């Protein structure tokens, strides 16, 4: 979560239909735009993010809501045109001894501006006294990892979260969804829509 990943999905046709089969029903909640009519509308560019957190922090993700993980790691902006995916990942992200590969931040000087990239690992100086890069009193290491084990409850289980962010610019629209077609009939009086001509 502290070191998220970004990919630019451009120059293609989207297939949002495939996303519904994931999860028993879903965790698909979608902010700022009608979830079911994203196919016909067209967009400029589609950014995508990905990370893994526990249960309550998927609620903490929502725009405006404040939480230690939320404010110190991702911090979605107030005006948001995009939406997120989540699902249970206990099957492939749980270690009996405990997974040490996933880390989160706990405390920082202030909050991050929306979409800020911070991978800071320096020793934190909470007090005015200089820590001088060594642990001790009032001088704490700023990164603490999770520990995912099967025996923990659903609240503490790992969840994989994928965040989509739609944007519009002066571009001629490139990355939007598919258009389906029907059969072709002849010799009958039929209204038609041939590639925009009607």
């Amino acid at each position, epitope marked *: 979560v502290y070191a998220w990943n970004r990919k630019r999905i451009s120059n293609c046709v989207a297939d949002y239909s495939v996303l519904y089969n994931l999860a028993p029903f879903f965790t698909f909640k979608c902010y700022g735009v009608s979830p079911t009519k994203l196919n016909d509308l067209c967009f400029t560019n589609v950014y995508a993010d990905s990370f893994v957190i526990r249960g309550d922090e998927v609620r903490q993700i929502a725009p405006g809501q404040t939480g230690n993980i939320a404010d110190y790691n991702y911090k979605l902006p107030d005006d948001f045109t995009g939406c997120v995916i989540a699902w249970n990942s206990n099957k492939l992200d749980s270690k009996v001894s405990g997974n040490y590969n996933y880390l989160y931040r*706990l*405390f920082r000087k202030s909050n991050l501006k929306p979409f800020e990239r911070d991978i800071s690992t320096e020793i934190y100086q*909470a*007090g*005015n*006294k200089p820590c001088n890069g060594v642990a*001790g*009193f*009032n001088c*704490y*290491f700023p990164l*603490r990892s999770y520990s995912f084990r099967p025996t923990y409850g659903v609240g503490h289980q790992p969840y994989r979260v994928v965040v989509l962010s739609f944007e519009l610019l002066h571009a001629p629209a490139t990355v939007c969804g598919p258009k389906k077609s029907t059969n072709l009939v002849k010799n009958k009086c039929v209204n038609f829509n041939f590639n925009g001509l009607k």
Partner: antibody
């Protein structure tokens, strides 16, 4: 007001375990630390270990090890210390100490000290 | 184990006289991770000096700390009858934080 509240006096049999609690109020608990100090009648102020409230990392001295446990709860804002395998030498006063944090800044020394918990170990 | 030993067992004096307190460390520590606590019978200890040189809030200027490495000193310029108590020195930086022997400052006659 910044203060630390400890549990009342306790009397326990040797060989068993004792539970000591320290409740904090009036300051940012999630940005503080807890230090446990034990003092007997006319004996040494001795170290039991310290914990970061925010992170929960723990450490213990060699003298007091494998029978001392430190746990914390954010909802109750109370510090918890567990001592097992009680002996006659464990009869002493248990103090909890925290560095006061006015706002987002924390005083560089331990100022808040509890009233102490009287634990008597005898059969 | 960084143990602290205070050589002066008794500091019998008169209110006002020059008071010097000693805290010896078996192993050296950082410059500004020591404490000085005064304890009255029946009362909880209270901090006097932090960082081995700085005075706590409400502490009169008569209390002063000095030293570096393994030898440190607690100085009280003028003794007052509220100042006769047991003084403790405690470290703040090593993995253990232990306390000193304790100097019983009492009156002399």
């Amino acid at each position: 007001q910044m203060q630390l509240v400890q549990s009342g006096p306790e009397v326990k049999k040797p060989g068993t375990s004792v539970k000591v609690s320290c409740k904090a109020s009036g300051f940012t608990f999630t940005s503080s630390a807890v230090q446990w100090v034990r003092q007997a009648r006319g004996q040494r102020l001795e170290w039991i270990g310290w914990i970061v409230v925010g992170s929960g990392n723990t450490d213990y001295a060699q003298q007091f090890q494998e029978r001392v446990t430190i746990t914390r709860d954010m909802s109750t804002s109370t510090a918890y210390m567990e001592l097992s395998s009680l002996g006659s030498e464990d009869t002493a006063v248990y103090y909890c100490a925290a560095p006061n944090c006015s706002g987002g800044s924390c005083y560089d020394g331990f100022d808040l000290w509890g009233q102490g918990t009287m634990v008597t170990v005898s059969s | 184990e960084i143990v602290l030993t205070q050589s002066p067992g008794t500091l019998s004096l008169s209110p006002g006289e020059r008071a010097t307190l000693s805290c010896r460390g078996s192993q050296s520590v950082r410059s500004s991770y020591l404490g000085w606590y005064q304890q009255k019978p029946g009362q909880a200890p209270r901090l006097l000096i932090y960082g081995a040189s700085s005075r706590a809030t409400g502490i009169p200027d008569r209390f002063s700390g000095s030293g570096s490495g393994t030898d440190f000193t607690l100085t009280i310029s003028r003794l007052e009858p509220e100042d006769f108590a047991v003084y403790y020195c405690q470290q703040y930086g090593s993995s253990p934080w232990t306390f000193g022997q304790g100097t019983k400052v009492e009156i002399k006659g």
